[PDB]
Amino acid sequence: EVQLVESGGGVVQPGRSLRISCAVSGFTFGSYAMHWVRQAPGKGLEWVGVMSSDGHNEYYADSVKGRFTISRDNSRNKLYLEMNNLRVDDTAVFYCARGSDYVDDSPPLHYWGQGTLVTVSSASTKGPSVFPLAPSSKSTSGGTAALGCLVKDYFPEPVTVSWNSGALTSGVHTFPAVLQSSGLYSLSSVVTVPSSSLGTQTYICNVNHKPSNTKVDKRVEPKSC
Amino acid sequence: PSKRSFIEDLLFN
Amino acid sequence: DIQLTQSPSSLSASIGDRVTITCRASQDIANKLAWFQQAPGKAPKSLIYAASRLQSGVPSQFSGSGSGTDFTLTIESLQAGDFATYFCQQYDSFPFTFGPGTKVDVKRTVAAPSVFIFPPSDEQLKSGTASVVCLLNNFYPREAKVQWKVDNALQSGNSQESVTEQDSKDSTYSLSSTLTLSKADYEKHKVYACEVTHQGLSSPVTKSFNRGE
Ligand SMILES: [Cl-]
């Protein structure tokens, strides 16, 4: 079975260079042209470039302008992408993909790896502050109240949020985080509950930020307004 | 080490 | 390089529908045109190559047609795994290029959002910042507009939003928007409002509070 596995992604400071790699199995690496594709968060697929099976030839997307270099090693059967002068919007998943096969009538980009995420940031690892989104008359509709937690100023992704240690799952919405201008992430998690429950039931969001070993259990109290 | 990516090789020529 | 345009940019459909998505190339690319499917958080999957050849392992409700500059992906009888994003891609010449993608989501009746607003917590205020959160819950279709107004002044550049994936059970979306001010600026103003525009609302809905209430 054809397999491609990217490695080397992670958090890197802007301006640095980063080399990611792709290891293969299930075919003869040296027989194939090899491609890289990138996908920025929430954006479309973007071809990066290709190197010929013997390494003699390469071609890049118009936007690369010499800043990324593909290389390969037909003895260890590894493909590389070296990304130089990194900037914040270089943050993307990078996929390696095999070139075509004329014998099997397989097109370029038939077989892909799972991707490796490159995150370009000057930020330091920081656990979030967890603030209540308190239920009030401003978050009620009919007989339901919305409440939540704001998980603010953490880096890097991801965080996880549960409610009441996983006992509360119905009506939960945990949103994608946003990256603030500070370079720290901010995420919200909300749940709708019966308004009648607010006087007797305790609502706690359990927040886990494993990169910083932060665990916060924030009780969300109602407001009288 | 036979070349299999004919499409790409043709474009490189 | 060769530009690939796709149409529509998004569409909603139901199980069993016939769906067509087009790709147009800015130059003749003969039959060197592929279609990809992508689900969230997964690598794309090759569906079609050489404009009309179905890839191994792909269900045959997918078919491709076209040659030269105009291409069509047809999904003859839409099934549950086919709610996804579709990309065309040309390999007629270097550099290889992709179209921008077409997202197919699940059709349902219009549902107006339930709108809720949350003032900043005393804990956050003590730290010198005020975040105000506006929640738009369980609406359809996905397109929605949030406007933040502070004492009737429209806010620009100080809010961010994100939207959940379509709910697997009720096919709705929800959206969260955060307005962030310094505590010093937050205390300069009284009325904090979120104004929501959506197809299910005959007039925009405003939720607001007064600082200190
Ligand atoms: Cl592209």
Author numbering:
A (entry chain H): 1 to 225
B (entry chain A): 812 to 824
C (entry chain L): 1 to 213
Sentences from the paper on this structure:
The coronavirus spike (S) glycoprotein attaches to host receptors and mediates viral fusion. Using a broad screening approach, we isolated from severe acute respiratory syndrome coronavirus 2 (SARS-CoV-2) immune donors seven monoclonal antibodies (mAbs) that bind to all human-infecting coronavirus S proteins. This class of mAbs recognize the fusion peptide and acquire affinity and breadth through somatic mutations. Structural and functional analyses show that the fusion peptide-specific mAbs bind with different modalities to a cryptic epitope, which is hidden in prefusion stabilized S, and becomes exposed upon binding of angiotensin-converting enzyme 2 (ACE2) or ACE2-mimicking mAbs.
The conserved residue R815, which is the S2’ site of proteolytic processing upon receptor binding for membrane fusion activation, is engaged in electrostatic interactions with the C13C9, VN01H1, VP12E7 and C77G12 Fabs and therefore buried at the interface with their paratopes. Taken together, these findings suggest that the epitope recognized by fusion peptide-specific mAbs is cryptic and may become accessible only transiently. Furthermore, VN01H1, C77G12 and C28F8 also inhibited SARS-CoV-2 S-mediated cell-cell fusion, suggesting that fusion peptide-specific mAbs could prevent S proteolytic activation or fusogenic rearrangements, thereby inhibiting membrane fusion and viral entry. In the Syrian hamster model of SARS-CoV-2 P.1 (Gamma) infection, prophylactic administration of either mAb at high doses reduced viral RNA copies and lung titers, and ameliorated lung pathology at statistically significant levels. We observed that VN01H1 and C77G12 neutralized authentic SARS-CoV-2 Omicron BA.1 and BA.2 more potently than Wuhan-Hu-1, likely due to increased accessibility of the fusion peptide in Omicron S. Furthermore, the neutralization potencies of VN01H1 and C77G12 could be further improved by engineering mAbs with smaller formats (such as scFv), suggesting possible limited accessibility of the fusion peptide region.
